Design a protein around this motif. Structure first.
Motif, PDB file in Angstrom:
ATOM      1  N   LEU C  60     -15.872 -31.741  58.960  1.00 53.60           N
ATOM      2  CA  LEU C  60     -14.753 -32.120  59.815  1.00 53.60           C
ATOM      3  C   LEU C  60     -13.426 -31.653  59.227  1.00 53.60           C
ATOM      4  O   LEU C  60     -12.568 -31.123  59.946  1.00 53.60           O
ATOM      5  CB  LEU C  60     -14.743 -33.632  60.027  1.00 53.60           C
ATOM      6  CG  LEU C  60     -15.556 -34.125  61.223  1.00 53.60           C
ATOM      7  CD1 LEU C  60     -15.596 -35.639  61.250  1.00 53.60           C
ATOM      8  CD2 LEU C  60     -14.977 -33.581  62.513  1.00 53.60           C
ATOM      9  N   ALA C  64     -10.752 -28.972  60.826  1.00 57.70           N
ATOM     10  CA  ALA C  64      -9.351 -29.329  61.011  1.00 57.70           C
ATOM     11  C   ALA C  64      -8.434 -28.326  60.326  1.00 57.70           C
ATOM     12  O   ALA C  64      -7.422 -27.908  60.901  1.00 57.70           O
ATOM     13  CB  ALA C  64      -9.093 -30.738  60.483  1.00 57.70           C
ATOM     14  N   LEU C  67      -8.406 -24.973  62.337  1.00 58.15           N
ATOM     15  CA  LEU C  67      -7.658 -25.098  63.583  1.00 58.15           C
ATOM     16  C   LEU C  67      -6.163 -25.189  63.318  1.00 58.15           C
ATOM     17  O   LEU C  67      -5.362 -24.547  64.008  1.00 58.15           O
ATOM     18  CB  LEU C  67      -8.138 -26.319  64.361  1.00 58.15           C
ATOM     19  CG  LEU C  67      -9.134 -26.033  65.481  1.00 58.15           C
ATOM     20  CD1 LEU C  67      -9.478 -27.309  66.226  1.00 58.15           C
ATOM     21  CD2 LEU C  67      -8.570 -24.991  66.427  1.00 58.15           C
TER      22      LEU C  67
HETATM   23  C1  LIG Z   1     -10.782 -32.041  63.450  1.00 52.70           C
HETATM   24  C2  LIG Z   1     -11.445 -32.998  64.444  1.00 52.70           C
HETATM   25  C3  LIG Z   1     -12.078 -32.282  65.642  1.00 52.70           C
HETATM   26  C4  LIG Z   1     -11.110 -31.355  66.386  1.00 52.70           C
HETATM   27  C5  LIG Z   1     -11.670 -30.819  67.709  1.00 52.70           C
HETATM   28  C6  LIG Z   1     -12.094 -31.923  68.686  1.00 52.70           C
HETATM   29  C7  LIG Z   1     -11.180 -32.056  69.913  1.00 52.70           C
HETATM   30  C8  LIG Z   1      -9.758 -32.532  69.586  1.00 52.70           C
HETATM   31  C9  LIG Z   1      -8.696 -31.427  69.679  1.00 52.70           C
HETATM   32  C10 LIG Z   1      -8.935 -30.430  70.822  1.00 52.70           C
HETATM   33  C11 LIG Z   1      -8.143 -30.732  72.107  1.00 52.70           C
HETATM   34  C12 LIG Z   1      -8.783 -31.800  73.008  1.00 52.70           C
HETATM   35  C13 LIG Z   1      -8.193 -33.204  72.836  1.00 52.70           C
HETATM   36  C14 LIG Z   1      -6.700 -33.298  73.182  1.00 52.70           C
HETATM   37  C15 LIG Z   1      -6.391 -33.177  74.675  1.00 52.70           C
HETATM   38  C16 LIG Z   1      -5.981 -31.747  75.177  1.00 52.70           C
HETATM   39  O1  LIG Z   1      -5.742 -30.884  74.287  1.00 52.70           O
HETATM   40  O2  LIG Z   1      -5.935 -31.627  76.430  1.00 52.70           O
END
Ligand SMILES: CCCCCCCCCCCCCCCC(=O)O
Ligand SMILES: CCCCC/C=C\C/C=C\CCCCCCCC(=O)O[C@H](COC(=O)CCCCCCCCCCCCCCC)COP(=O)([O-])OCC[N+](C)(C)C
Ligand SMILES: CCCCCCCCCCCCCCCC(=O)O
Lengths: 1051, 114, 99
Positions: C60, C64, C67
């Protein structure tokens, strides 16, 4: 900015509720899913009454239907596919496929027609088929878990799992098709589009999944000691596979995921030995979360919606439905009772009853019902679907999940085998004795002296969980004694690691099958031990056809005209084909675009460049031609494949100037490329077909790999059988008392051993290329395993701390993983290498050269005689290729020898006549070294590790290896630990004879091979080829010119 | 590390000598000898004080290996082993004083007073 | 193992969400304390769960980090280069020495 999601609290609450329910309902037979449904119903009622919790529950109560179809179902499907046992499933491919597919189709059609007929709801055929597909999916994890707990009938569990997986996948596909047909009508279409749609749904999915699985498996074999990268890339591959399959193109996604999971699970060897545990745990927890969420959602939604518009009469219908779904399925099994009886493993009435009663509906049907209810907006549909699905699930969970244990007990499947019971009794007796000994030792301590002795019961005793005509007797008891001896020998071989897994499984299966069979000794070698050794299929014919297709002249001379060698080497270099391949693959781009434009200032620049594309590549091919033709002379046309290169260029130019750019005549008015070009010339793509030439050798690698796997399995089975037979022989020799039984037993053992040895030799002769690779891998494995054991022992001894041991272990496993990617085929070593590798003259180069100077090569035709029994010693023979059969009198022993064996040592060393006539089984090439030459060599070389020394050490080890087995009294030395221990010992030099050899703890046991000896206690004379036991303390040498006394010790 | 790699080489040679005498894995190619290779060392590259000091370090290595063996058996746990080895090497690097004088270095853990 | 892993994950997520949303207390400190306390008492954890938990949290964190780095690269490449001043670079150098 002001975010406050309300979906985490609901998933966490369901999480905790499921954890509590699972923990509480452990011993009780009722599954916790019923408790989850009840809790969901209560929560739904409360949220209906109280708007506060309704604000949090409405997010999932009216959750978008497509998320259930596109997230939850693929997760469960992939989790089910991953945890499969691929080999057992493969062993029952056709049976599982036929049963699952035909049963699903029949059950769906019958349930649909019942729904139209019996139910008073006005339903058409499509909705009825959707209903059947919903109520035709099962997930019996409980039944297979109980069967595995019982520890018997693994085939039943494998069949159940396969049927469940196939049923789920096909039911999801059918439901998707019919839901799209019903809720989203799309005008009318002819059969032309329908056939393409069917093909895209059925075939195009598994192919895409297989391609992605192969790509990711290939990319996964080049990653070393990077767990994070492997895990992350596997997850990314799975998610991308499903998303691309189900969104960007309109192919089915569940089938692709199933295929990818099965392929990855099959090739788990490339995965590092700790990643798959993490992956399994991750997918298990994801499936658990999905199941809990789905159950809570269906509970809430049913409790609201179905109970708004529930009819009193409907309940009655439900009851009949239950009978239907518990009858038709069973009928299907009966309808296939004989059909699969002669195919695969088979079936029996008890297994059929268990299979019929073992079908429990799961979360897949609930998810489909929820999707249908969400899509609809009326009462006649959606309410009835959800109500009936929930009722059926609840009924099955309440009835079958609780009555399955009683049904299993009735049917006489819960009994415990007497051998298992007595083994458990012996184990617990062992445990009690060890505990008593340890307790007696601890009390005598000075520190832990006055501790309270309630530990005696705190540690407790591990009680048994089970609790609760004159000749046939010894015949049968000796038979079962061989069975247990063979089984424990195979188990010990597994625990050492040389026997792998599949070979052990096959051996034990044959053993118990022949044990349960009435009056026939196991492993008759006729057919039961034949298919694995054979491994015959047109693999070899395809391989030979590929090799004959890829044929070329040996070499091309270099004319001194012009530059000559420089141009020839630039044309024959691998860079040439590298650039031609690169040019072709980068020509795939332009050929694709023009085609795109064909099927279609932007257009102006497109035609400006695209034409530039062909006017450069053509010149490049022309440039290649001048190199590939010139410096090759006529050869340009000798290569029948290379003739294709001339054609491509001729077509190129002929359809670029005479067909295109018309300004002189030729086609002119004719409706050719002049008015065409949009077609005909497009043939440029033919340039791609040119790759095959390089693509042909790649298929050889995969054929070699398949044959390598088959050969490795056969070799492992044969070795294991041979080792088990020798151990079993030395055991039976001392355990049995009677004589005629013993002689018959040894006869049956020896016949099978000789047959297997001969068959393995013939197979190795028939396939030379891959046998060498197999032998090499097993050795590197055995050596690396022993090195790892030595490293572990050294770390345990305290000389090395933890981090250096961990580093060296990491190096060892990296080496093993690199070994795992070894080439499938290796060319056989030359006779010079064979002569060089021989142990007793290896090492130094002077002796190797002296031997190589005079070692004649002899060719022998099939069915000749090399050495006659009773003939004077003349020299040795190094078997370079072929098989030889040795027959001699000792019990008239016989044997078979192959490449790398030498038979002249005893005679050439002790000047005695030969004792075993050797004949040739095939054409054989041997190395003959004269006895006079060997005498000259041994006289010449008299260093500390003399030739005389080395030869006698080899002979002494060979002679003394079987003798130790006697002293082995059921100690289980595996015939290998003794060899190692003996290898540690050395041959001492008897420099003086007037001395007396003493014995002590350092030298343990000693063996005499040559000469004679006398006891230092009672003047007991003893000859050379015998053991001396231990009753002697000192060894008295003597002067004897008749024979040289040789002593070999181990310390 | 030199002793460990010497051990490893001897074991590899013994195992190779054992296999060469087999009947089945008799004529396999012997390029494994380098394929399995050798695990080389990664590092590569007044009359009384002598015996006094050498005997001192001999007790240090003996104590260290004894503590390591006790750990590998499992009776010594982890923190006790860490404290013991720390005291051992500290007193070893210290000039002319035998380890574990029991005055204060081996007193706080036994005391545990608060 | 499944119950332990799932309850640990639920406890962590619920702790942070309740601390940072329902009441106005800081969330990072609570998570730090919870993690340290759980790590201190890892003996109660079954001898194979913590390996899975460590691997899960490591992957995880890796996701992170990747990204975040890609996001900052894209956003800086657009926005900072719309309105970057030539003199500012000089300032940056001094800043480095300072830090
Ligand atoms: C590091 C933890 C996991 C990261 C990826 C999982 C999804 C969270 C971030 C991606 C965007 C989706 C959630 C936010 C809402 C959006 O962007 O519309
Ligand atoms: C091994 C896997 C398991 C076995 C294989 C799985 C499922 C079986 C196979 C293929 C499914 C298609 C054929 C099944 C019967 C349906 C017949 C049919 O007609 O289908 C057609 C499919 O054509 C299409 O429109 C394709 C359009 C959809 C694709 C979107 C682009 C249904 O659309 P329709 O126009 O007839 O609508 C019906 C309306 N009317 C009655 C007035 C004609
Ligand atoms: C079983 C896989 C994990 C399930 C939980 C992870 C989040 C997916 C389902 C919860 C709802 C959030 C995503 C859908 C959008 C929404 O509901 O607004």
């Amino acid at each position: 900015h002001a975010h406050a999601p309300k979906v985490i609290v609901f998933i966490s609450g369901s999480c905790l509720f499921g954890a509590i329910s699972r923990s509480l309902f452990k011993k009780l037979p009722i599954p916790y899913t019923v408790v989850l449904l009840i809790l969901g119903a209560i929560l739904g009622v409360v949220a209906s009454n109280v708007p506060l919790v309704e604000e949090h529950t409405r997010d999932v109560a009216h959750m978008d239907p497509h998320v259930l179809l596109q997230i939850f179902l693929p997760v469960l499907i992939f989790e089910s596919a991953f945890a499969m046992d691929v080999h057992t499933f493969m062993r029952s491919f056709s049976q599982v496929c036929i049963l699952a597919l035909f049963g699903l189709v029949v059950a769906s059609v019958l349930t649909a027609v019942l729904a139209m007929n019996l139910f008073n709801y006005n339903w058409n055929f499509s909705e009825a088929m959707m209903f059947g597909a919903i109520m035709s999916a099962t997930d019996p994890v409980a039944v297979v878990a109980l069967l595995k707990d019982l520890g018997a009938s693994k085939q039943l569990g494998t069949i159940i799992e396969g049927e469940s997986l196939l049923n789920d996948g096909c039911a999801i596909v059918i439901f998707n098709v019919f839901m799209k047909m019903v809720f989203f009508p799309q005008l009318t279409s002819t059969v032309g589009q329908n056939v393409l749609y069917f093909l895209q749904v059925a075939v195009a999915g598994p192919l895409w999944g297989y391609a992605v699985a192969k790509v990711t498996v290939f990319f996964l074999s080049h990653i070393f000691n990077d767990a994070l990268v492997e895990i992350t890339i596997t997850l990314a591959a799975t998610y991308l596979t499903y998303y691309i399959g189900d969104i960007w193109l309109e192919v089915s996604g569940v089938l692709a995921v199933v295929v990818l999971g099965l392929i990855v699970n099959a090739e788990k060897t490339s995965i590092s030995p700790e990643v798959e545990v993490f992956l399994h745990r991750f997918w298990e927890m994801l499936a658990y979360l999905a199941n809990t969420l789905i159950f809570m959602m269906v509970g809430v939604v049913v409790t609201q919606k179905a109970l708004v518009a529930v009819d009193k009469m409907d309940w009655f219908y439900l009851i009949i439905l239950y009978l239907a779904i518990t009858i038709i399925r069973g009928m299907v099994i009966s309808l296939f009772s004989p059909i699969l009886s002669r195919i695969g493993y088979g079936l029996t009435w008890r297994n059929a009853v268990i299979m019929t009663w073992g079908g429990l509906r799961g979360a897949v049907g609930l998810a489909l019902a929820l999707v249908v209810e969400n899509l609809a907006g009326n009462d006649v549909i959606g309410s009835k679907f959800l109500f009936h699905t929930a009722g059926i699930v609840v009924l099955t969970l309440v009835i079958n999940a609780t009555t399955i244990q009683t049904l299993l007990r009735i049917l006489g499947m819960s009994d415990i085998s007497i051998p298992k019971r007595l083994a458990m009794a012996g184990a617990v007796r062992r445990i009690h004795e060890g505990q008593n000994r340890t307790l007696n030792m601890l009390k005598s301590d000075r520190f832990l002296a006055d501790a309270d002795w309630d530990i005696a019961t705190a540690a407790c005793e591990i009680s048994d969980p089970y609790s609760a005509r004159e000749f046939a007797d010894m015949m049968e008891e000796a038979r079962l004694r061989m069975l247990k001896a063979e089984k424990i020998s195979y188990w010990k071989q597994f625990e050492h690691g040389m026997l792998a897994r599949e070979a052990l499984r096959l051996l034990v299966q044959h053993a118990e099958v022949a044990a349960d069979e009435k009056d026939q000794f196991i492993l008759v070698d006729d057919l039961k031990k034949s298919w694995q050794i054979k491994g015959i299929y047109p693999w070899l014919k395809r391989k030979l056809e590929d090799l004959i297709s890829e044929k070329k002249i040996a070499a091309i001379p270099m004319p001194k005209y012009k530059l000559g060698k420089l141009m020839y080497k630039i044309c024959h270099h691998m860079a040439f084909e590298v650039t031609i391949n690169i040019a072709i693959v980068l020509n795939i781009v332009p050929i694709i675009m023009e085609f795109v434009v064909q099927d279609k200032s932007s257009l102006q620049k497109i035609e400006d460049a695209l034409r530039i594309s062909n006017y450069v590549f053509f010149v490049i091919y022309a440039i290649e031609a001048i190199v590939k033709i010139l410096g090759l002379g006529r050869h340009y046309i000798v290569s029948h494949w290379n003739k294709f290169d001339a054609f491509i260029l001729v077509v190129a130019l002929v359809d670029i100037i005479i067909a295109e750019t018309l300004l002189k005549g030729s086609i002119t008015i004719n409706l050719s490329s002049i008015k065409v070009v949009k077609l005909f010339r497009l043939l440029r793509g033919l340039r791609m077909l040119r790759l095959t030439k390089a693509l042909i050798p790649k298929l050889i690698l995969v054929v070699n790999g398949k044959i390598n796997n088959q050969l490795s399995l056969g070799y492992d089975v044969g070795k294991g059988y041979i080792i088990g037979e020798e151990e079993v022989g030395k055991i039976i020799d001392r355990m049995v008392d009677n004589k005629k039984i013993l002689r018959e037993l040894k006869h049956i053992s020896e016949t099978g051993r000789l047959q297997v040895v001969k068959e393995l030799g013939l197979l190795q002769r028939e396939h030379p290329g891959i046998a060498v690779s197999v032998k090499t891998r097993q050795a590197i494995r055995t050596i690396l395993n022993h090195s790892r054991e030595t490293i572990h022992e050294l770390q345990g001894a305290g000389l090395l701390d933890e981090m250096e041991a961990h580093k060296l272990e990491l190096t060892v496993e990296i080496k093993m993983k690199r070994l795992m990617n070894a080439p499938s085929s290796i060319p056989p070593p030359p006779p010079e290498n064979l002569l060089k590798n021989v142990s007793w003259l290896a090492g130094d180069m002077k002796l190797i050269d002296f031997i190589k100077a005079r070692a004649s090569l002899l060719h022998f035709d099939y069915g000749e005689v090399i050495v006659r029994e009773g003939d004077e010693s003349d020299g040795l023979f190094l078997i370079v290729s072929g098989l030889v059969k040795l027959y001699g009198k000792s019990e008239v022993f016989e044997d078979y020898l192959t490449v790398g064996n030498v038979i002249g040592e005893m005679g050439v060393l002790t000047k005695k006549p030969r004792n075993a006539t050797v004949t040739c089984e095939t054409t054989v090439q041997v190395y003959f070294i004269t006895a006079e030459d060997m005498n000259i060599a041994i006289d010449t070389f008299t260093l500390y590790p003399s030739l005389e020394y080395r030869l006698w050490r080899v002979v002494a080890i060979r002679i003394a290896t079987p003798l130790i087995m006697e002293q082995m009294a059921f100690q289980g030395w595996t015939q290998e630990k003794v060899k190692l221990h003996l290898e540690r010992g050395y041959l001492v030099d008897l420099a003086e004879s007037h001395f007396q050899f003493n014995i002590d703890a350092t030298l343990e046991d000693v063996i005499l091979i040559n000469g004679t000896a006398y006891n230092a206690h009672t003047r007991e004379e003893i000859r050379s080829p015998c053991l001396i036991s231990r009753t002697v303390h000192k060894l008295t040498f003597q002067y004897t010119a008749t024979e040289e006394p040789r002593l070999f010790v181990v310390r």
